[PDB]
Design a binder for this molecule. Sequence first.
Ligand SMILES: NC(=O)C1=CN([C@@H]2O[C@H](COP(=O)(O)OP(=O)(O)OC[C@H]3O[C@@H](n4cnc5c(N)ncnc54)[C@H](O)[C@@H]3O)[C@@H](O)[C@H]2O)C=CC1
Ligand SMILES: [Cl-]
Ligand SMILES: [Cl-]
Ligand SMILES: [Cl-]
Ligand SMILES: [Cl-]
Ligand SMILES: [Cl-]
Ligand SMILES: [Cl-]
Ligand SMILES: [Cl-]
Ligand SMILES: [Cl-]
Ligand SMILES: [Cl-]
Ligand SMILES: [Cl-]
Ligand SMILES: [Cl-]
Ligand SMILES: [Cl-]
Ligand SMILES: [Cl-]
Ligand SMILES: [Cl-]
Ligand SMILES: [Cl-]
Ligand SMILES: [Cl-]
Ligand SMILES: [Cl-]
Ligand SMILES: [Cl-]
Ligand SMILES: [Cl-]
Ligand SMILES: [Cl-]
Ligand SMILES: [Yb+3]
Ligand SMILES: [Yb+3]
Ligand SMILES: [Yb+3]
Ligand SMILES: [Yb+3]
Ligand SMILES: [Yb+3]
Ligand SMILES: [Yb+3]
Ligand SMILES: [Yb+3]
Ligand SMILES: [Yb+3]
Lengths: 494, 494, 494, 494
Amino acid sequence: DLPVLLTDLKIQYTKIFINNEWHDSVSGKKFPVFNPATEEELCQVEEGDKEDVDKAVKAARQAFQIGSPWRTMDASERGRLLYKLADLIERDRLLLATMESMNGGKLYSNAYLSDLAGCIKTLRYCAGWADKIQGRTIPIDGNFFTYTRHEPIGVCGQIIPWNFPLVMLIWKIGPALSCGNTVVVKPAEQTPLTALHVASLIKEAGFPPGVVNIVPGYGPTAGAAISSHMDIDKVAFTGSTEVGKLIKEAAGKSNLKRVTLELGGKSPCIVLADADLDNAVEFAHHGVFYHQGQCCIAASRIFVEESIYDEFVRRSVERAKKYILGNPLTPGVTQGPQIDKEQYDKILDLIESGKKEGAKLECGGGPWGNKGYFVQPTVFSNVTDEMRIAKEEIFGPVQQIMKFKSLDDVIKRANNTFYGLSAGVFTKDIDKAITISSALQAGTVWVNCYGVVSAQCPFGGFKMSGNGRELGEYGFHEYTEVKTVTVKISQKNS
Amino acid sequence: DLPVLLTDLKIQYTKIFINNEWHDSVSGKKFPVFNPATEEELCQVEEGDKEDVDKAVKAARQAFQIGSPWRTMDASERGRLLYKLADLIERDRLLLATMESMNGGKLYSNAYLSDLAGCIKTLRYCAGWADKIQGRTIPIDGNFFTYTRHEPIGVCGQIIPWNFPLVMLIWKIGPALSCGNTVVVKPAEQTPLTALHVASLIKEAGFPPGVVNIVPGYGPTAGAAISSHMDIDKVAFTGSTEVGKLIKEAAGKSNLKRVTLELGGKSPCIVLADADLDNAVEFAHHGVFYHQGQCCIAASRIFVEESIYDEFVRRSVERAKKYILGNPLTPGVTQGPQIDKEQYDKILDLIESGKKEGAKLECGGGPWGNKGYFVQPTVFSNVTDEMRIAKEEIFGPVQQIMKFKSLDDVIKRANNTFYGLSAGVFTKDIDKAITISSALQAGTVWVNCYGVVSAQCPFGGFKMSGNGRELGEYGFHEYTEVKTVTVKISQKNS
Amino acid sequence: DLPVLLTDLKIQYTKIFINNEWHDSVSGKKFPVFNPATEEELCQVEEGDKEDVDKAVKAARQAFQIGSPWRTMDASERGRLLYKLADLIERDRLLLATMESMNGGKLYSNAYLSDLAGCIKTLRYCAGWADKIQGRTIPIDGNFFTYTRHEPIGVCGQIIPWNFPLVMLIWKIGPALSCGNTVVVKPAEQTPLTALHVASLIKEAGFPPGVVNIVPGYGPTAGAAISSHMDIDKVAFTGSTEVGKLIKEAAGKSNLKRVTLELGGKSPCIVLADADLDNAVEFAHHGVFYHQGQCCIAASRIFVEESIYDEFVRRSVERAKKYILGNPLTPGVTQGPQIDKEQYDKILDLIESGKKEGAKLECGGGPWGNKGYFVQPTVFSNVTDEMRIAKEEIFGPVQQIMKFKSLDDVIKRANNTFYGLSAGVFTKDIDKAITISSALQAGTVWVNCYGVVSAQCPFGGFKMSGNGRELGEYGFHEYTEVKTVTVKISQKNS
Amino acid sequence: DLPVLLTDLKIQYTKIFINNEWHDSVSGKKFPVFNPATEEELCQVEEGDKEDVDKAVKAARQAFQIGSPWRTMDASERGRLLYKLADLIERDRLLLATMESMNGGKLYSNAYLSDLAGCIKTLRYCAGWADKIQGRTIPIDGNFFTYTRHEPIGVCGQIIPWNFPLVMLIWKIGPALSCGNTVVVKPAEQTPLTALHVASLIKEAGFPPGVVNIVPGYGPTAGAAISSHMDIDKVAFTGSTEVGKLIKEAAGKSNLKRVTLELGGKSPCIVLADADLDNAVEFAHHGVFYHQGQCCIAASRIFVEESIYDEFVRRSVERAKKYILGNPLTPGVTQGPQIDKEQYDKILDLIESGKKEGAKLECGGGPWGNKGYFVQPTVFSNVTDEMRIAKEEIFGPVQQIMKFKSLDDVIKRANNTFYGLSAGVFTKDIDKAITISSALQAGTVWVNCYGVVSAQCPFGGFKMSGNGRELGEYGFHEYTEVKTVTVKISQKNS
Ligand SMILES: NC(=O)C1=CN([C@@H]2O[C@H](COP(=O)(O)OP(=O)(O)OC[C@H]3O[C@@H](n4cnc5c(N)ncnc54)[C@H](O)[C@@H]3O)[C@@H](O)[C@H]2O)C=CC1
Ligand SMILES: [Cl-]
Ligand SMILES: [Cl-]
Ligand SMILES: [Cl-]
Ligand SMILES: [Cl-]
Ligand SMILES: [Cl-]
Ligand SMILES: [Cl-]
Ligand SMILES: [Cl-]
Ligand SMILES: [Cl-]
Ligand SMILES: [Cl-]
Ligand SMILES: [Cl-]
Ligand SMILES: [Cl-]
Ligand SMILES: [Cl-]
Ligand SMILES: [Cl-]
Ligand SMILES: [Cl-]
Ligand SMILES: [Cl-]
Ligand SMILES: [Cl-]
Ligand SMILES: [Cl-]
Ligand SMILES: [Cl-]
Ligand SMILES: [Cl-]
Ligand SMILES: [Cl-]
Ligand SMILES: [Yb+3]
Ligand SMILES: [Yb+3]
Ligand SMILES: [Yb+3]
Ligand SMILES: [Yb+3]
Ligand SMILES: [Yb+3]
Ligand SMILES: [Yb+3]
Ligand SMILES: [Yb+3]
Ligand SMILES: [Yb+3]
């Protein structure tokens, strides 16, 4: 039961989306969109720049004004709309999963069974919170009545990467809209198409115009205009550390807008001697190779206790030699290409660093094919902590395996990184599971599993892996602004 | 560092406490209080009855009126007072721990190091919640402003047992007072003395008069008047199942007052083959014998996997043969007497049932001494589920050990009881710890420990072990009444 | 836009619903169902009794067992099912609103626009909470890891009245199912039909069998079997004070099951001189007359400041003389009949008490028509606090108006009642709105409105109007059982 | 009852506080501290710079390591320590209030009755939250057990201004320490003395060494080292907008540390025709003049409805002509000096702008005295929105009064500012109170009062008045880092 589109994908939505209207770029400029598997242009899309961002902000601001339909409508009706949007995405699931695969280099079975399901589930999750966002009444000192309103912040700019275009769009807009904000979204330039399809469903669902505005285009242009905008109240971002820095600096220099960032990881696994070995090998393998390694949570440092290290490495190699590379639309294909040249170049450079720095190559180590940005799935053993491949996020299908004998020592090595997005602990010992997970400086710690992510759980980094949490009860906080209202009364009673 | 009173205990507070005044009984009647270790009368105390309860209710109601000092004072000042009460109990810790030991038959080192510390810590815990009890603001449908006040309920009657006189007093009054209620407390007739000492500290701390009223006396008289009172808003009770039934019936027949009950247990432990055996033997042993078995959470059914059953039983017997019986005030003494004749008679009867029903006696089985209600610490092995000693709460120093070989089967046996107060799981397997604890129908489940109780955790039964939770964030709910206030406005905004 | 059924209502579902199966009664007995507007039998329905209740409990218990589909399914999938049930009720909205009108004596426009909309909205609300019900992790003293699971309680029996058959069914099952409980519902004998239609939609939606069981029949028979059942964990009830007492007594005598009750009110309004007079007259009028006065929150004592009292009474009379009595299915009809003989007899008796006790009759005072249990809308002025019509819940179209001159005095009169379900305050003074609403002993206080009830707000009584809250964040608490899990660890860290 | 020090203040604590040790500066450099009332040096204090900050960070980091006393101690014991610190500050209240007055230019009666009381109350408030900071257990999709730990972040740098030296120290360290963080505090260079006294009490209370480190010194040196530190996890700051920008930029460039800022305001009051005029005049007057206008929440734009504008201005002038300037230690003195030259120069410049720009001078307008940075209390009427005195935070005793006739218009004018810290609404109309307060873009809105600030309420800005909230339940969030722990299990049950 993996259904496909029974007819070919026609691209339809290629324009800037503002006030539920399709707009050309102010400049009239357009930019190409490619398929990473063939390197062939799929279509051209309107190139948004500062002007267009200003128009989206004006629209978003107007939709947020006191008295507008989006401010005055029932919170439950905000939730009603998100739920309807989820039904619509469910309706065009074949279409959207195909678009995502073709534009994103993303295996179609994953796109359909995982990304699409996740979008749908996350929207329904966010829909449910709308009329459950609540302030407090507070027994303040003195004769006063004090309450708080957890209001929407206002206009939220949301800058989205290319690895999970749809999932990231929903993670950004679900919470924001549930809380009553308005949004200006900038998709990755590589991957605007699915966002614009969803924009058509936003209109069809009946969101008031200006509540969601989507401005495709480039980072230093559209992206920067957002980060430096004097009338955007908050910017949320997932992507590189470099750009994260640029965003915070821009925000600080302009209007001190709120910022929340999700950036790299170099997430470690710790595998103890008593671990279920096959379970640990399987989760860690998928933990690093998922979506061609193009995952913020990629399990890119795997520490295995010496007595099981050789066995662990052997079975990891076996598992990795089993992939089929090719077009992510063809059933049976189990590894697509990397998103683009730059990522491809970075991965190969880093692989080359691994060889030169004296890591042990178990398989892969080079590119594949005549077309597309394919990289062989690659495994390194005997990796040490000073190697580039141990320190830097690779974002490619490249796994690092490394041995330890001292538990104290491996916790410190696991934490000796400016990243801290997630980690994995594999053991049958209760005390070790609890104590190790407490001691890892990482936003999500999985025990005897890896890459388990759901709408009900907050997600975010420690340290330079970012700030703030997305999703879960806790994530909803980052899309509200608390206002305290305190009223003089003649006499208070408990 | 176990300090003692350097001079003999003089009893001073022997009267009914209402409106911060010491009152004689309306009847003029008094009743004896005894020391369970010597069977000798310590003093006489004013016998409260219906009349006196009516006076306490009138006082409590007046103190709760809108505009009174207790309703209008800052919530933080309610907390200030509880904290001061805790300082005072800390000041008279030697006095109070000695009184508790002498009146309660309670080992003095436990009284000092545990009961007193617990009272003090729980008061400070409850103090901290006072100005953190909060309502909500709610995004209701339509043009309205809606908030909730989590108000105190009103006059709470609180009926207290004899096993932990002081601890139970603090568990009842800490939460109730933090939430702004007023209370009418009825101590166990066996153990009024420590409650009345604390009453003097309530006055010294400066609680408004009528906020705490203490009416010593008997159950069918004072107790029943509370349960059937038409102006008491809530009754809380810890004690027997029988009386729990009487209370609920009385409440239903009178004014449908809120009721929360903590009643027996027949709490099971499940010890798996892989358990740390000594750890499990030690916690389970203390789990059943603590305070002469006079604990609601007594670990009175211990299921041990067959392959470690004989070993478990052997070491449990060793551990139990090591006690020293005698006066709980004398250092070195490690087991005091039972509270009174009735409890003593019940324990011996049940021991006799165990012998007649064909359980295996490993040690004890009879009374001890010429004076005091002492029972030898007693262990039974080969106990089956149909035996009285397997089914009924003993509330004496009597341990039941029982074997299993099928994990499915033992979970069902562990749950095949109308009680459900707590349980213990002993294992090194993570999955078993989590899955077993989920499947036990019990309010508290300890893993690789037992009898761990703290102010930060809610505590209460499943099934006929009672209803409601005490302590923790969650317990505070049972001492508030939610009022929804909904105000028409011209236009709402998110 | 008030659409109707374009074809006549065929009754189809007339049987006991257990394990998603339609069952005959064990006895083979059936009972008539009538239309209160014509006094004519609509159909016959299987009469459930103790036996049938036992079968529903066995089914509900089996569906709740550890490992069953309802325990193991994702919480979000529980929510998915409630949302689907809401879509289905939306699909059969014409059918269900017509059935409700014909069986319940309920105005069809209200049934369609209000009851049906409320059911649908409340289900969607409850759906949203399913995967947002959360426990805690707790910084307990000592080296332990402590968490809580907010588990479903288990088998919940739910006894439902006839005034809002559908709304009450949804209020009971929405929260219960969202929290993962299983239910045994007993509809009012007068009004089983809509519950059984919904049961067919429960099957169609795909709830696991045994999760919802509906047992139509009579109170002393089916109802009592529930209240006294040894394997039902909680009973929830809306109805009379008398039966509420019977339920609590039954629960206390049997297995100490949890009980939550919603019972009468004699809800007061206080209208100050500065009130918007027309607004206050309009809300108070609808507050008392809604659904032929057959509302728990009926505004059955209206206190008006002397200087505006005569004016208030005059305009209230005008408003009340405007009704059209008749069949609730016919457009234009603005007052249907009372549910049945007993209610009719009670209303007329109480009207007669009002005349004999010297209250002033402004209009009505007698029955209407040749068929159906119609009572003229009736207004009394100069009512005093000792009159039966001031003290007792009438549950008929009978309004009491009463004057005050002293604000202190009227708050005490408003509170001088064993009821406390709701109240209304009408004023333009901020301080008075806040202080008066704080001082009224009532679960919901409306300011400058009345009868505003939504899914986002908890709802329940003070005093003998019941215990517990339904709906809102807070109401969900009453459908969970908290279990504390505390695990020994070697060393804890903050 | 305003007691004083019965002997002269001896300055004792003048050094850098690290690991509970008093340190000289690495450079050996010291800097003068002055009394703003006399312009005379009080003493010299060790000048902390980058080196010293590095030492404090190393100490704070070590104290935060897994396994340290501050990580492993009971949460309730963290709370115990804060409560003890509060007792100690209460003990040295005369000393501390005098030091604060003499160093801060702060009226002694305010220092004693307000600042000191606030510190003490806020510490006790923060103490109470320690063991009530809780994570969640979460019904995630799939067979997993998921919980969250709300952990301390780590090393928090805290940069403090001179207007409320003590209050700001407690607002920063109370929450941070309650949540289990360690701190590096940099006092205002003008006002280090009271922070260092408190440091001695931190030692006396028994906080583990390295938990609180205080590094007096200058902003571009000590301050910047904090903001740019690669091992500080979070920086909190109260002060200028300029420095706020510098901090965020520094944080973004270095290690992307979390940042929370409280910056200026230009907080508006809106006074409607129906307002209680005297109440509004009194609160607004104190709202702007408190502590010589050196308050972030200064009510520096007062919009009054035309029909009451002249009256409002007249009575405001009367109230302002009543002050006595002089040394803040002398009883009867009702206005002290400004903190220093720079602030003095800024205030006078802005006053001069007001005159040149054509605002109407009602009183004041110039400096006062031969010594000290005194400015006459100054009132301007007929102020327009384009004037410097309407746009810029003055931070001096300078009040702006301004008329409106259109309610829509005044809400927009009130919001037409990049600030948004607080606002005041004065009216007897319920609907206006609620709707206006909702529509103002400000973190705290007072109704019929002003400057009401308590520990139980969160406090923070909208827009460029900052980000994050301090105090209240909500403020505690900004001092925790959420970690999600997700464990694979064989089968989950609800
Ligand atoms: N709070 C509310 O919404 C309601 C209040 N009432 C009050 O009660 C008065 C009498 O009306 P009734 O129809 O008699 O309400 P009731 O309390 O007699 O009936 C309501 C439900 O309770 C059940 N019941 C009856 N006897 C029972 C028993 N022995 N054990 C368990 N369940 C039993 C009924 O079958 C029905 O399902 C009304 O005049 C009104 O004042 C009645 C219905 C709803
Ligand atoms: Cl395996
Ligand atoms: Cl790039
Ligand atoms: Cl090519
Ligand atoms: Cl969380
Ligand atoms: Cl051991
Ligand atoms: Cl007894
Ligand atoms: Cl007895
Ligand atoms: Cl004897
Ligand atoms: Cl809890
Ligand atoms: Cl509750
Ligand atoms: Cl009107
Ligand atoms: Cl009846
Ligand atoms: Cl009846
Ligand atoms: Cl007839
Ligand atoms: Cl609530
Ligand atoms: Cl006044
Ligand atoms: Cl400066
Ligand atoms: Cl000079
Ligand atoms: Cl809040
Ligand atoms: Cl937050
Ligand atoms: Yb880039
Ligand atoms: Yb190529
Ligand atoms: Yb008894
Ligand atoms: Yb004897
Ligand atoms: Yb009845
Ligand atoms: Yb008739
Ligand atoms: Yb500066
Ligand atoms: Yb000078």
